[PDB]
C-alpha cells in the first residue's frame, strides 16, 4: 500500500487509516521518539505538520512541490486546535500568549 494524497477524516485533519480506505501510515509515538533521538527536527516537523495535519501547510506544500520548490510553510496543526477547543469546552481557559 502507498499514499501520496487522497481523503482524510472529519473530526481531525489527519489522513484515514487502512487499505480499504486509501490511507497513510500511522507515524506513532515511538517513531517520534526515534526521530527525537537523532537530530531530525525538520523531518519530524514535516512529519507531523505538513504531511499530516496542517491544512494550509499541506496545500502550500503540494503547490510548492509541483512548482519545484521543496520548502514547507509549517503553521500549526489542526488537531492541536481541536485540543484547545475540547479543553476550552470545559471550564478551562487555555490560551496562546505574546508574539
Amino acid at each position: 500500500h502507498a499514499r501520496s494524497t487522497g481523503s482524510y477524516s472529519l473530526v481531525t485533519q489527519q489522513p484515514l487509516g487502512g487499505k480499504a480506505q486509501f490511507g497513510g501510515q500511522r507515524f506513532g509515538e515511538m517513531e517520534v521518539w526515534a526521530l527525537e533521538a537523532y537530530g531530525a527536527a525538520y523531518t519530524l516537523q514535516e512529519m507531523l505538520t505538513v504531511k499530516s495535519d496542517d491544512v494550509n501547510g499541506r496545500t502550500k506544500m503540494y503547490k510548492n512541490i509541483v512548482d519545484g520548490n521543496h520548502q514547507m510553510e509549517p503553521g500549526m496543526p489542526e488537531s492541536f486546535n481541536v485540543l484547545l477547543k475540547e479543553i476550552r469546552s470545559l471550564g478551562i481557559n487555555i490560551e496562546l500568549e505574546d508574539e
Binding site: 501520496s4 472529519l10 525538520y42 499541506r58 492541536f80 481541536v82
Partner: protein, 1335 residues
C-alpha cells in the same frame, strides 16, 4: 509567533466572550430532510452556514455580499470550517459545580473550603444544607445542616438566618472567602503549631490559597454557570452507509443537559414546590457532571446498549485521547507499507522499493517533473498520464528517485536504529528489498514482517535523511560501543567455512606468490578452500603519523585466509584473518577497522564481507542432515548408571533410611551430573570427531560437522540447543516452579514419547506466556523513561566543575566481573589521574579517555578513575558536553544539541524484552590481603578477630589494582592478617552465622549483671549432652514485674574492679539481647575472640522497582545521626531506639518494629550511612544519608546487575542520566533570605539559580535538600503541564495547572511535538538559540 501557553479558569464573562450565541433547544436536526434546527444545538445564527458563502435557506449564491443576515434565514455568511472554531454556551438554569475541581483527589474545593469531600457531595446532591453567614445564632460557617437540623432552626432562628444548599450555597461560600485573610491565618497557624500531621495539612492548604491569589483565578469560577459547548464540527454528525445518522456521544450529553435545563426553567416559571425543583436541579447537576467527566460520579450513563458513552474528559485522557492518539502520533501522507524480503545485491546505503509504491509515493515530484519538460500542460493531464502509466513516466521516476532518501521503519520501533534512511533502487515486484546486515538493527527477520516507507518532502528533511539517518551513518549502536552492522548468520558460516583448515587437502603445503593466485588455485580446481599453505602477503601497517608502511612477508596460513585477505583494507594487520573467524572475531574485525581506518573503508568493507560470506556459503553447501547429530555411544550406559543410582535411593526410601527432601535433592543432583556427563560425551563426539590421516598415521582436528560449524561459528545455535538435539534434554520443570525428578532422557533425534513431550509443553507454554505478557511491561517502561527524560538536551560545553563519580571496577566476590576499561571508556576525567607510582600527571584533568588513553591506563594498572558523571553536572536546564562523555556511535564528544535523554531512555528500555520477568570465604586467586572499615583485635590463639561488622576484605594483587572484595561479619576468625601474602585457594576467613559472637576486647573475669534465674534468664539443662547453659529470655516472655531487667555481662579483673576499654574510662559491658543462650558461665576467665552468648536467628520488575523507586517491604533501617545508641519503651506498637550524638544535639530517635533481627548493641556508636538492621535498602535513605553519588552508584550497580545477569551491554551514561531525572526535585530546609517557604518542594535548578543570583550579591543563599522522586511521580511533577499531561492522568494535572494558573514556557521536546514546531534538540537547536537570543 507565540511563546508560552497559559491555562487558567474560565470566568462567565470569558465564556460569554468565547461564544457566538446561546444554544437553547436540544433538537439536533430535522432528520427527515437535511436541514438542522433553528435554533437548536446545531443552529445557523449562533454558529454559521453549513455551505461555504451561502445562506443555507436562500440568498447570496455568488461572491458579493458576504455577511448579510436576512430575517427569513437567521444565518451568518462565512467558510465551511468557520463552525469548527465557533463554540456555543448553555445558560444553565441552576448552578453546577465542576467535577474536576470537586473530585480530583485531592479536590480543589475540598482543601479550599476546609470541608470533607463526603460532606461536600451531600450538600451538592441536594441531601444536606449549608450555612452562610447566619448572624447572631449558635452555628458555624462551615458546619452543615440536615432536614431535622434545619427544621428546628427554621422555627428557632426565623429571622436573620441563611442556610442554602447545592452549588448555589457552595458558590456563595467560595465567593465570600477572603483569600488574603486566610493566608495570614494559615501562615500564623503553621508558625504557632508543632503537630507534624497538622503542619503538612496546613502547608498543603496554604499553598493552594496563596497560589490562587498570585493569579487571576476567582473562587467563584469553580462552579459552572455558563456551560460552554464544543463546536459541531468537532462533534460531527455523519451518517454511515445507509439512511440513518450515527450520532456522537457528546450530542447525547449536550442534548440531555439542554432538555433538563429547559425543564428547570419551566418549573421555575410555574413555581413548583421545593422537592420537585430540588430533584430537577439535582438531575441537572448530575447531567452536567456526566457531560464533563462521565463515570467519575456513580455508574456512568449509557445509550447503546450497556456501554457507557464517551464524554469530553474521555476525549482528552487515556490511550485514545488527543495527546497519545492525534498529537504525539499522527497518520501521515506520502507513506507506504509492504512485506519485506532480502535482496542481497544491495549496498548498505540503499534498499529496494517497488515500482508501484514508487509511482504512488512520488506523485507530486513526477507531476512537477512532467510540467517542467513540457510534455503536458495542466495538472489534470499529468494525473491522466500517471493513471494510465505511459512509457515516459518511468524515466521521470528514475529521475526523481536518484538522490532522494526514504525512511524505512519497522513497526515496533524500540530504539533509534529502527528508523533508517536509504536510497531507493526500483524493484519489479511488490516487496521491499532490505539489505541483510541492517536487519540486525531492525530486529527484522523475514518470516512475514512488514515495514513502512516515509518520504522526506522538504529539502532540509532530505539532508537530515542523508546526513543523520542514513544507514551508513548508523554502524554503532547508541547504547554502547558495539557495532550494529555485525554480520548475522549466513555470512559468518561462509567465513567460518572459508577461513579454516584441515590436515590434508588438495595443495597441502605448497607455496604461493600472492593472494591473487590463491583465488586462482581455488577457482581452477587445483587446491582446496582450506589447505594450509605458505603465501606471501603484503600487510600495510601505518606505524608513522598517517603514513602507511608496507611490510611483505610469508605467512603460514591457508588458501581461504589469503582469499579473505584480498578484501581487507590496507591498514589492518594480517592476524585479523589468520584465526578461524567465528562471530565474535568478525565483530571485532569490523570494530578494529572502524577504530583505525574510519567510516568509509568500514562501510565498503562491511559490504565486501557480506558479499564474500554469501558467495562462499553458497559454494560451501553446508546442509543439515539426520546423521549430523551424532548420538554419543556412551549415552545409554550413562542413563543405566543413573537408573541404578535412583534404584539405590528408592531402595533406601522403602526402608526409610533417608528423608524425602534429601531423596528429592539426591535425585536432582544425580540427574544434573548425568546430564553434564552426557553433554560432555556428545561435545567430545562433535568437536573432534573427524580423524583423518595426512601422509601416514592418523591425526585429529576440529570437526567439519554441519551442526558443529553452525554452533562453533556462532551463526545460529549454542551449547544448549545442540545439546538438546544430541544429548538428553535435561530436567524440565512443571509450572509449580519446582523441578520434576524424572528427566527427559530422549533427545530430538530419538523420539520423545508422550509424557516427555507433555512435560516439554509445560516448559514451553510458560515461555510463550512470559514473552507475550512481558512485552507490555517492556513497552510501558520505555514510555515512562522517555517521558521522564523528554527535556534534557546537551546545551553547554563545560559546566566548570571538579566533581564526578569514582569509577572502580565492579567485583561481587568472584573474579573481577567488569573491568575498568568498560566503565571509563570515553568518559571525561574529573581531576587528573595520578600515575600509580608517585604523584605523576599521567593523564590531564579534562581529557576524553578513548582507546589509546585506556590502553595507557591498562599498562600502568590504574586503580580507579574519578570521572565526570551526568548527575554531577552543574548546568541549569541541560547537561554540559563534558559531563556526558563520548558520543557512542560517534567517536568524538557529544555535540552541542544532541538529545541524550531520549537515546538514553530508549537504550535502557529497549532490552526490556530480553530480560526475564518470572559458611565462610574461599579465595580463588593468589595475592596480597588488605582490610578496610576494620577495627580488630588479636585473640589468644592468634587469629585476628574483628570488632567491626562492616569490614571489607580486599585482595590486592602485586601491581596495585583491587582484584577481590568480600564482606566479613562482626567477630570472624580470620586465618590471615593485614598486608599479608597468601596462597591460591587457602581459606582466610571463618565464622558461624547461626551464633552471633559477643566477643570482647580485653580479658578478666565474668559477672552476671542483672541476670537472675527465674525472671531474667531461665534454666534449661541440656538433654543429650548434660553441659547446661543459662538461657537468656527476651523482653516479651517474662512478665511485667521483671521486664525492666536487662541481662548483661561486664568483664572485671582478678579483684572485681571494672577493666576499662583501652582508650576510654568506660567499662566494657555487653547487654545481652533476646533469644540468646549463655555459652561461658560464671567465674570463667575470658579472652578476645570468645563468644559470650549463643544467638540463633529479580529481572524486569527489579528494573521497574529501581527506576520507579518503590520501597521493599522490609527495608534496612539506618541511623540519621551519629553517636551513642540505646533502647526505649517496651512494646507499644514498636520498640524505641534513641541516638544521642557525642557533640551534636540529642533528640533524634526512631521506633523500630521489633520483628527484625538487629545488628547494633547498646554500647555501640553509629554513623550516618551505617546499618542498623539488614535487608534491602530504599534509595531515599541513601539520598538523605550518604550522598547523591552514593545513590547514583546504587542504581547503576543494581540495574547493571540485572542487565549483566541477562547479558546485555549498556553503558552507564544512560542510567546516570535517568537517575538525574529522578532526583531533580528538592525540598527547602532553611528558606534563608529568598522568597520560598519552609517545607516547600521546589525544583533544584530554580532554587540554585535563585540563591546563585542572590549569593553573588551580599545576601547568603538558601540551603536546600534533594529528594528522589520515582519516574512517574517525577514526570508528572514538572514545570510544564503539557509534558505532564501527554503522560499519565490528565484530569489531575489539568486541574492542578488550572487552579494554579500555570504557564508553559515550552522549552522541551514534547511541548514542541504537541504544538507543532521544531524540536529544541536536534537541527532545531540553532533555531531555538536564535529565538532565545532575539528576545
Amino acid at each position: 509567533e507565540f511563546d508560552a501557553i497559559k491555562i487558567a479558569l474560565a470566568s462567565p464573562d470569558m465564556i460569554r466572550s468565547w461564544s457566538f450565541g446561546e444554544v437553547k433547544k436540544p433538537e439536533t436536526i430535522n432528520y427527515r430532510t437535511f436541514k438542522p434546527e433553528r435554533d437548536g444545538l446545531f443552529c445557523a445564527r449562533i454558529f454559521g452556514p453549513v455551505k461555504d458563502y451561502e445562506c443555507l435557506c436562500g440568498k447570496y449564491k455568488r461572491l458579493k455580499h458576504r455577511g448579510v443576515i436576512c430575517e427569513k434565514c437567521g444565518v451568518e455568511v462565512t467558510q465551511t470550517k468557520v463552525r469548527r472554531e465557533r463554540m456555543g454556551h448553555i445558560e444553565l438554569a441552576s448552578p453546577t459545580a465542576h467535577i474536576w475541581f470537586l473530585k480530583s483527589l485531592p479536590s480543589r474545593i475540598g482543601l479550599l473550603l476546609d470541608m470533607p469531600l463526603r460532606d461536600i457531595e451531600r450538600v451538592l446532591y441536594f441531601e444536606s444544607y449549608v450555612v452562610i453567614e447566619g448572624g447572631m445564632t449558635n452555628l458555624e460557617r462551615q458546619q452543615i445542616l440536615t432536614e431535622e437540623q434545619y427544621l428546628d432552626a427554621l422555627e428557632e432562628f426565623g429571622d436573620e438566618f441563611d442556610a442554602k444548599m447545592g452549588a448555589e450555597a457552595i458558590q456563595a461560600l467560595l465567593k465570600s472567602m477572603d483569600l488574603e485573610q486566610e493566608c495570614e491565618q494559615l501562615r500564623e497557624e503553621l508558625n504557632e503549631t508543632n503537630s507534624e500531621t497538622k503542619r503538612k495539612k496546613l502547608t498543603k492548604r496554604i499553598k493552594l490559597l496563596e497560589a490562587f491569589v498570585q493569579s487571576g483565578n476567582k473562587p467563584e469560577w469553580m462552579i459552572l454557570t455558563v456551560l460552554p459547548v464544543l463546536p459541531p464540527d468537532l462533534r460531527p454528525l455523519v451518517p454511515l452507509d445507509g439512511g440513518r445518522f450515527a450520532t456522537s456521544d457528546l450530542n447525547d450529553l449536550y442534548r440531555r443537559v439542554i432538555n433538563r435545563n429547559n425543564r428547570l426553567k419551566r418549573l421555575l416559571d410555574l413555581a413548583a414546590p421545593d422537592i420537585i425543583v430540588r430533584n430537577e436541579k439535582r438531575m441537572l447537576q448530575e447531567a452536567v457532571d456526566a457531560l464533563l467527566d462521565n463515570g467519575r460520579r456513580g455508574r456512568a450513563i449509557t445509550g447503546s446498549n450497556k456501554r457507557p458513552l464517551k464524554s469530553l474528559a474521555d476525549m482528552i485522557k487515556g490511550k485514545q485521547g488527543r495527546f497519545r492518539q492525534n498529537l504525539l502520533g499522527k497518520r501521515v501522507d506520502y507513506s507506504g507499507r509492504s512485506v519485506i524480503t532480502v535482496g542481497p545485491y544491495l549496498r548498505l546505503h540503499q534498499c529496494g522499493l517497488p515500482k508501484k509504491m514508487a509511482l504512488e509515493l512520488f506523485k507530486p515530484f513526477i507531476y512537477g517533473k512532467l510540467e517542467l519538460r513540457g510534455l503536458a500542460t495542466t495538472i489534470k493531464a499529468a494525473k491522466k498520464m500517471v493513471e494510465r502509466e505511459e512509457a515516459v513516466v518511468w524515466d521521470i521516476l528514475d529521475e526523481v528517485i536518484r538522490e532522494h532518501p526514504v525512511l524505512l521503519n519497522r513497526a515496533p520501533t524500540l530504539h533509534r536504529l529502527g528508523i533508517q534512511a536509504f536510497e531507493p533502487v526500483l524493484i519489479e515486484g511488490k516487496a521491499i528489498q532490505l539489505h541483510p546486515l541492517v536487519c540486525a538493527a531492525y530486529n527484522a527477520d523475514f518470516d512475514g514482517d512488514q515495514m513502512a516507507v516515509h518520504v522526506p518532502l522538504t529539502l532540509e528533511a532530505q539532508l537530515e535523511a542523508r546526513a543523520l539517518m542514513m544507514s551508513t551513518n548508523n554502524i554503532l549502536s547508541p547504547a554502547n560501543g558495539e557495532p550494529i552492522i555485525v554480520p548475522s548468520q549466513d555470512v559468518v558460516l561462509g567465513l567460518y567455512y572459508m577461513t579454516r583448515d584441515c590436515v590434508n587437502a588438495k595443495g597441502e603445503g605448497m607455496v604461493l606468490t600472492g593472494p591473487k593466485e590463491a583465488e586462482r588455485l581455488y577457482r581452477s580446481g587445483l587446491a582446496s578452500l582450506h589447505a594450509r599453505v605458505k603465501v606471501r602477503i603484503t600487510e600495510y601497517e601505518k606505524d608513522a603519523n598517517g603514513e602507511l608502511v608496507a611490510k611483505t612477508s610469508l605467512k603460514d596460513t591457508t588458501v581461504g585466509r589469503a582469499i579473505l585477505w584480498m578484501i581487507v583494507p590496507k591498514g589492518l594487520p594480517y592476524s585479523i584473518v589468520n584465526q578461524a573467524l567465528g562471530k565474535k572475531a568478525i565483530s571485532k574485525m569490523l570494530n578494529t577497522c572502524y577504530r583505525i581506518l574510519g567510516l568509509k573503508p568500514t562501510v565498503i568493507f562491511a559490504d565486501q564481507i557480506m558479499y564474500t560470506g554469501f558467495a562462499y556459503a553458497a559454494r560451501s553447501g553446508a546442509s543439515v542432515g539426520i546423521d549430523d547429530m551424532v548420538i554419543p555411544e556412551k549415552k545409554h550406559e550413562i542413563i543405566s548408571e543413573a537408573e541404578a543410582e535412583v534404584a539405590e535411593i528408592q531402595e533406601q526410601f522403602q526402608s526409610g533410611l533417608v528423608t524425602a527432601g534429601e531423596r528429592y535433592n539426591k535425585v536432582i543432583d544425580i540427574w544434573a551430573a548425568a546430564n553434564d556427563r552426557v553433554s560432555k560425551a556428545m561435545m567430545d563426539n562433535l568437536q573432534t570427531e573427524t580423524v583423518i590421516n595426512r601422509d601416514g598415521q592418523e591425526e585429529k582436528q576440529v570437526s567439519f560437522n554441519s551442526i558443529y560449524m553452525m554452533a562453533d561459528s556462532g551463526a545460529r545455535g549454542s551449547a544448549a540447543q545442540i545439546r538438546q538435539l544430541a544429548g538428553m534434554r535435561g530436567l524440565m520443570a512443571k509450572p509449580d516452579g519446582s523441578i520434576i525428578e524424572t528427566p527427559i532422557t530422549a533427545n530430538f533425534r530419538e523420539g520423545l514419547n508422550v509424557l516427555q513431550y507433555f512435560i516439554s509443553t509445560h516448559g514451553a507454554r510458560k515461555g510463550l506466556a512470559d514473552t507475550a505478557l512481558k512485552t507490555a511491561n517492556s513497552g510501558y517502561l520505555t514510555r515512562r523513561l522517555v517521558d521522564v527524560a523528554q527535556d534534557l538536551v546537551v546545551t553547554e560545553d563545560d559546566c566548570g566543575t571538579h566533581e564526578g563519580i569514582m569509577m572502580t571496577p565492579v567485583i561481587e566476590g568472584g573474579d573481577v566481573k567488569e573491568p575498568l576499561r568498560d566503565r571509563v571508556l570515553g568518559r571525561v576525567t574529573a581531576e587528573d589521574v595520578l600515575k600509580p607510582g608517585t604523584a605523576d600527571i599521567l593523564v590531564p584533568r579534562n581529557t576524553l579517555l578513548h582507546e589509546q588513553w585506556c590502553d595507557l591506563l591498562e599498562e600502568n594498572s590504574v586503580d580507579a578513575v574519578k570521572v565526570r558523571s551526568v548527575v554531577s553536572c552543574d548546568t541549569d536546564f541541560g547537561v554540559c558536553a563534558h559531563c556526558y562523555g563520548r558520543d557512542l556511535a560517534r567517536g568524538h564528544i557529544i555535540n552541542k544539541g544532541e538529545a541524550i535523554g531520549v537515546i538514553a531512555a530508549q537504550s535502557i528500555g529497549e532490552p526490556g524484552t530480553q530480560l526475564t520477568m518470572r559458611s565462610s570465604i574461599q579465595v580463588k586467586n593468589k595475592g596480597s590481603i588488605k582490610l578496610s572499615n576494620v577495627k580488630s583485635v588479636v585473640n589468644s590463639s592468634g587469629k585476628l578477630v574483628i570488632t567491626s561488622r562492616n569490614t571489607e576484605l580486599k585482595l590486592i594483587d602485586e601491581f596495585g589494582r583491587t582484584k577481590e572484595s568480600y564482606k566479613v561479619p562482626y567477630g570472624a576468625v580470620l586465618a590471615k592478617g593485614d598486608g599479608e601474602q597468601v596462597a591460591g585457594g587457602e581459606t582466610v576467613a571463618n565464622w558461624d552465622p547461626h551464633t552471633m559472637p559477643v566477643i570482647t576486647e580485653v580479658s578478666g573475669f565474668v559477672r552476671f549483671t542483672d541476670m537472675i534465674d527465674g525472671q531474667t534468664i531461665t534454666r534449661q539443662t541440656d538433654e543429650l549432652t548434660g553441659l547446661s547453659s543459662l538461657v537468656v529470655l527476651d523482653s516479651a516472655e517474662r512478665t511485667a514485674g521483671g521486664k525492666d531487667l536487662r541481662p548483661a555481662l561486664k568483664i572485671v579483673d582478678a579483684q572485681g574492679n571494672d577493666v576499662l576499654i583501652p582508650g576510654t574510662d568506660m567499662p566494657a559491658q555487653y547487654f545481652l539481647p533476646g533469644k540468646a543462650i549463655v555459652q561461658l558461665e560464671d567465674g570463667v576467665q575470658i579472652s578476645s575472640g570468645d563468644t559470650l552468648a549463643r544467638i540463633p536467628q529479580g529481572g524486569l520488575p527489579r528494573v521497574a522497582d529501581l527506576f520507579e523507586a518503590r520501597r521493599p517491604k522490609e527495608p534496612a533501617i539506618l541511623a540519621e545521626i551519629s553517636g551513642i545508641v540505646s533502647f526505649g519503651k517496651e512494646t507499644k506498637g514498636k520498640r524505641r531506639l534513641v541516638i544521642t550524638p557525642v557533640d551534636g544535639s540529642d533528640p533524634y530517635e526512631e521506633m523500630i518494629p521489633k520483628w527484625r533481627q538487629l545488628n547494633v548493641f547498646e554500647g555501640e556508636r553509629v554513623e550516618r550511612g551505617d546499618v542498623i538492621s539488614d535487608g534491602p535498602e530504599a534509595p531515599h535513605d541513601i539520598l538523605r544519608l550518604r550522598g547523591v553519588h552514593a545513590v547514583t552508584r546504587y542504581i547503576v550497580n543494581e540495574v547493571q546487575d540485572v542487565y549483566r545477569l541477562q547479558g546485555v551491554k549498556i553503558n552507564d551514561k544512560h542510567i546516570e542520566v535517568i537517575v538525574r531525572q529522578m532526583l531533580r526535585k528538592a525540598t527547602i530546609v532553611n528558606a534563608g533570605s529568598s522568597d520560598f517557604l519552609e517545607g516547600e518542594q521546589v525544583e533544584y535548578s530554580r532554587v540554585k539559580i535563585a540563591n546563585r543570583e542572590l549569593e553573588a550579591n551580599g545576601k547568603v543563599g538558601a540551603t536546600y535538600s534533594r529528594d528522589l522522586l520515582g519516574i512517574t511521580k517525577a514526570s508528572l511533577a514538572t514545570e510544564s503541564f503539557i509534558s505532564a499531561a501527554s503522560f499519565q492522568e490528565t484530569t489531575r494535572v489539568l486541574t492542578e495547572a488550572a487552579v494554579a494558573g500555570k504557564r508553559d514556557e515550552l522549552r522541551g521536546l514534547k511541548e514542541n511535538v504537541i504544538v507543532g514546531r521544531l524540536i529544541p534538540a536536534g537541527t532545531g537547536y540553532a533555531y531555538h538559540q536564535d529565538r532565545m537570543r532575539r528576545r
